[PDB]
Amino acid sequence: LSAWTNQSGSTLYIQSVDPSGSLSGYYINRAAGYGCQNTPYPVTGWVYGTAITFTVLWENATESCNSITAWTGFYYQGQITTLWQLVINGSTSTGQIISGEDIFKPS
Amino acid sequence: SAWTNQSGSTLYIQSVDPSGSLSGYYINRAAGYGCQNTPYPVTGWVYGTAITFTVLWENATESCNSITAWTGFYYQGQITTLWQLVINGSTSTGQIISGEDIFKPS
């Protein structure tokens, strides 16, 4: 499979991209200061030429962080540059949606 | 379940796995945009009131060479979301287009 590590040490493990552009994978979070680190969380999304989206549910057999992330970005010059948005369960305001930028390189 | 936003676009959720895995189609009716009136594939996650979904702007009818991802929550009978749209062949995060959609039941 096709592994991509960001500036924070987290890795996207792509298992499959169908001819439809449907992506399936798993993701290990190693970002400082976050729960749900060091264990697999499921991935879904889309691949369309150099454009990509993917989204991780922060629940697996062992740990839950009660939330989801969606990444949106693009493949250029051997890296996937992404903007991500993180929404917590029970949220009442878009002001509570946390955001940032991730750069993934092959690993 | 069907959800229509302020621009008249509808998210058609067909299933939610026990794992929270979301599957459906989406019909874009947003003025000024291509890929209107035809169903696009949806994947995503639900976690209590938290929702992400992503639409590939490719089908057999019309292609717009791009993908949108919505991140949002269910609150007071509506889904409030921020979305990000990335175009095939992009070279800067400046080319990513963004906004807010509010979805109510249809």
Features:
107 residues; mainly beta; unknown function; homodimer; globular; Biotin binding protein
Describe the structure.
Two copies of one chain form a homodimer. Chain A contains no helices and eight strands. Chain A has one domain (1-107). Chain A is 0% helix and 64% strand. Chain A has an eight-stranded antiparallel barrel. In chain A, a hairpin with a 4-residue loop joins strand 2 and strand 3 (22-28). The first copy, chain A, is an all-beta fold and 107 residues long. Chain A binds chain B through residues 20-22, 42, 44-46, 48-59, 66-74, 76, 81, 83, 85-92, 94, 97, 101, and chain B through 19-21, 41, 43-45, 47-58, 65-73, 75, 80, 82, 84-91, 93, 95-96, 100. It is classed as unknown function. The entry lists the keywords Biotin binding protein, avidin, biotechnology, unknown function. It forms a dimeric assembly. Short wilavidin apo form.
Largest interface: A-B, 42 and 43 residues
**Helix amount of chain A, in percent?**
under 10%
- Radius of gyration of chain A (CA) equals 13 Å
Series of H and E elements of chain A: EEEEEEEE
Disulfide bonds (chain A): 36-65
Binding site for biotin (chain A): 6, 10, 27, 29, 35, 67, 69, 102
PDB class: unknown function
Keywords: avidin, biotechnology
Concise account of the structure shown:
Two copies of one chain form a homodimer. Chain A is built from no helices and eight strands. Chain A is mostly beta strands.
